[PDB]
């Protein structure tokens, strides 16, 4: 619903491109609640904040569509 291009915050892009040369550092802490996923992210490992703790999760291929917030659910039911 943003047909003028997708969106990811700059204080994550610059911090994800900065590894494009060498290997990737296992940690990218973030807020992780406003960013969709771009093709330049495959193979990384981004930890995801849920308002309480950051959740470390890698990046696969098909896991490229949605936003970052769909992996650290802030519900915790059971």
């Amino acid at each position: 619903s943003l047909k003028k291009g997708p969106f990811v915050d700059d204080h994550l892009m610059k911090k994800v491109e900065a590894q494009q040369g060498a290997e990737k550092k296992k940690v990218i802490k973030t807020w992780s609640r406003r960013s969709t996923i771009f093709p330049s992210f495959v193979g990384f490992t981004i930890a995801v904040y849920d308002g309480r703790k950051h959740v470390p999760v890698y990046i696969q291929e098909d896991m490229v569509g949605h936003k970052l917030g769909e992996f650290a659910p802030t519900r915790t039911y059971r």
Binding site: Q60, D62, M63, H66, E70, F71, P73
Partner: protein, 112 residues
Amino acid sequence: ARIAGVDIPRDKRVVVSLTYIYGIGNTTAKKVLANVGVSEDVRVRDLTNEQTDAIRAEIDKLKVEGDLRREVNLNIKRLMEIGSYRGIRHRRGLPTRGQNTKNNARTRKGPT
């Protein structure tokens, strides 16, 4: 068996009966018939052997089959096996927006 994949009834009206097949709504039937150039005919359908082939051809230009389910199935499969909150609540049924579930089971499971 019967005329398109399967599932065509007898002694009905045409355009309605063409919706019956899995994947054909209402616009599909009207546009298909448009590309042949036909009408109701009439309330007990009395099609000709040529019109049947015409519609059998124009239908085979649509992803709608007795196989549309396989695509949907694999899509929700890709969903439920990566993250996935949508897939997780798709092991328990919640939508693209959520509705504050303290009645939203009376359509999915018959909670009572």
